[model samples]
Target: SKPFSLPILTLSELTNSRFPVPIDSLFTAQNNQVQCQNGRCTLDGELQGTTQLLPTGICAFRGRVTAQINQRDRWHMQLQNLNGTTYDPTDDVPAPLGTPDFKGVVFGMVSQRNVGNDAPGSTRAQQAWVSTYSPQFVPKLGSVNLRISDNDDFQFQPTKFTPVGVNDDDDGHPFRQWELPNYSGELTLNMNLAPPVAPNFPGEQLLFFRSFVPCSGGYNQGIIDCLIPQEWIQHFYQESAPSQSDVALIRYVNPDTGRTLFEAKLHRSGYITVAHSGDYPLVVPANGHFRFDSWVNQFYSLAPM
Candidate 1:
């Protein structure tokens, strides 16, 4: 008898509504040997699968699989070439199947988590968080909020504040430092204040904030305050004025490697004011007078991941 033909599969069949779908539903194996150990499973043999692509692209697969590694959180499905030929363990060849028009080997994995689920899956029985792979996987970025007060001498102020001429050798005093994770791409910074609940205050109270780029040197004399010479001071007044309790400084930094990617200072008290924000393209020594090192330390201490 001839081999049975498999069902036509779409990418949606490979994953749940989420980018990383469940492994159980990802594929069907035929004439395979499966091994389970240490909360993981490995499969070897023939396999067929499907995958969803961005903008309504669907891909189907039929390939000889030399190995399928499965973990509690995620699973990895490796496919041989289209000729059903398995490559050596050390083979660096890319997969032979991929979304139409995209050149690369077809790889497969599904996370345990149910993507795009409106209800929490944990509440249900037989469900837990799992890591899986998906061609459509897009990382979610997390953020942290730092409160800045009008008082210059606030306790938290020193944690991120580095004065000019302060060398690394200076007697250990509290200086600004943050250790951030490896991050790349555009960083966003926003600043705002709350409006007065009661109308007791007269006119609009102007609010201002500034972020300085620490200079690198033994006792860096000064630092780069802003990309624009005048942007160092951002002011916000009436009309567009933010609430007093609003975020004072909202800046974006790389979550990975913890580098300062972009900086912006927003000042809004009245309708009239100035503001500045930009990417940090200028180069300075790594640990000289510039407080970039301090900022890294500060971020690392606050959010280690």
Candidate 2:
């Protein structure tokens, strides 16, 4: 309910492997209807359902932590799949039936430095030193490697390049910073989420968020590149019955308008939208259901995956 506060600490020391970390703030009112059901949650349907917290502010769901770091520090956090006890991508992505369940204790320290605001001299930046590992890979095709902050003056980067061609990346130029192919590193993650019941819906699948920031230019900062597997898309449309659906894709809807605002068309890389609440469909109907196709379920059913 309060504003986010940043804490200063060492990166490695922050790993507790104990307490549950609260990274992102949940606007309860906007997401009260968003709930994970039947061990599954729909992507982009419910705000409160199982979410892929990116650790990064834009693409991923905000973690349980609150403060914005002004300097370097270490943090340890974990999560339990409150809906049930499943966080497996293989279980959901495969076929036949079943939904992937993701709930775990994410243990790691985020090390970063805050420079200030964005100006000739006023700007804040940080390079998170984290190594994510899941005991199993079936449920989730893979783990996500993410870095969040405004400035890109550090060594570690997300994808290799900048975001271009997408409707939002119409800036013409990519993020300019380090350089192209500056350093080779992995920048992809595996996870999954689904909308609330519509029972018999195949809720399980291996979801991945590849680097949205491409590697074509001299290193553009504004771009965020990522890869979504086609396997996941194919299964969803096949089982869920889509008026429009594709495999290896990422999607988003303006929660305020029930409009499909963001979705990667076929092999057109991934999709991108202004990572903010306004970009999603707004909850309406006044009742529990946020009017979608048939005023079906609650908001949590449709919360963005």
Candidate 3:
């Protein structure tokens, strides 16, 4: 039998062929032999453990080489956290506290030419080689934390108490600085790229997953909150398939005193609302800081779809 030989070709040469041009060109190199499966030829690998070794039993894919079209070379892969929650393709964004359920990492390599042409065996594995290829952005976990509390504060704020603080008696008694309570919630990975502002390409931006758990012996009720795109509401409600929309609402309140933080008019769409329930929904205004036990009396809400 004759050994198969694929001539080395430039990206420009291969892309012009009958084969479909590669849309995901991240880490792709020239002169690399192309592997075709169902239809797509992107190199797809999944990360399985803390160690760097790729796992076995996974479906290996053969890919072809081509130029990356569009701004910012983009590739999409799934990731699984220590937790077991799997993310749906449509649900690319990670929920609060939920990690990626599957590992989605892809690596590219080349095959070495054998000295004597013998039938390729399993041991005839691809060789590791570097190419001029580069990714628009490196994939990484997000740094943002979810809890709003003493140890974890907001972007801009300080720990200080008014003269007549929670435990204070007399108005003249000078209030001292106190550590703010912590809030908890999930942090998702997401990104955006507009033409004028960023690489107008597919998969240019990235989103990460993280979460916070509230501490006990606390003075305030830690809140669960997130700033998401309006689109999430529509997706959530559509998936629920309820006759009446049971979409979540985002209401604001003071976490410290169990009071109504503040209420923003619920718009048809594209507005951020912060709502709180329980005892102090109306009383607690801005700065959602209330007693921990009281948190049961108060729950946050968001706009309905």
Candidate 4:
């Protein structure tokens, strides 16, 4: 009742979809209760359930290959490991694979307003935006046009990677980078993860990490952001994780007494906390509201449309 406070009534909004389904619908939260076989997603398992394996070992749980709008105006589903699969650095990482870091793998989230029905359980089309977390670098922001990466510098750019082609008789079949947005040319970026990181310096991976906090927090009404529970960081990363103090440059406050419920100086890396501040902890029992410390301070936040 207390520990698992991520919103569902609120979250389900983005989970409902017909095609290009959100990841949550395929893999439900295990609550640190099951035999959690966690790792970066892969395409090893036989595609049975809604789960899909892109030709590149990239996993998708939707009905189709392209992206789809859900019941909500926004969509952000954390990618989970394939049930019977293992992370194959070579096959899994999106192309131009030189020296790869599974931790720095490219997984992402997207949202937009005014495209579709725009209702609570509705999904959409334009003014939409998506965000890539790890292996961070500056992509043009708020530029207003869609773009693709091809320069020699962006070795990991979408173009350099294996195309998500529709499945066929080839190696793993499901050819080319199908489904989700496939860029024909480079476009300007409006949405981005920030605070500008310096290299492989920031160790923690937030939205893209294995078993991430389902920060169902949203951009529905006011200023809202998601919290990465310390509970998650400890369990999933069970390694030399930076202390909350060392990781969090910001914190969360009890919505009621204004008491500081969790003070995790965690992540020290935003990949989001860097810009919008999504690096706080859900220490107190949040009924509905929680404030970012960096807002009186912040947390990984989603601004209003």
Query: What C-alpha lDDT do the candidate models reach, one value each?
Result: 0.19, 0.23, 0.20, 0.22
Return the TM-score for each candidate structure: 0.14, 0.19, 0.18, 0.21
lDDT of 4: 0.22
Runs off by more than 4 Å, candidate 4: 1-248, 271-283, 288-290, 294-305
lDDT of 4 by residue, 195-233 (tens): 222212233223311122121223211111122222222
Best by TM-score: 4
Which of the predicted structures, 1 or 2, would earn the higher TM-score when compared with the native?
2
Q: Model 3: per-residue lDDT, tens digit, 13-59? A: 22211011211111111111111111111011111111111111111
Residue-wise C-alpha lDDT for candidate 2, range 1-305, written one tens digit per residue: 12111122222212111011211111111111111211221222221212232222111211122222332222221211222243343443321112112122122223323233423232223433222222221223323333233334432211211111111122242222112110112353322333322111122212212222322233332221122222222232234433232222323344455565433222111211222222233232221111122212111122333
User: Highest lDDT, which number?
Assistant: 2
Worst 10 residues of 1 by lDDT: 36-45
Question: What's the TM for model 3?
Answer: 0.18
Which portions of model 2 miss their true places by more than 4 Å?
A: 1-61, 65-73, 80-126, 133-305
Q: How accurate is candidate 2 locally (lDDT)?
A: 0.23
Give RMSD to native, each candidate. 28.7, 18.4, 26.0, 19.6
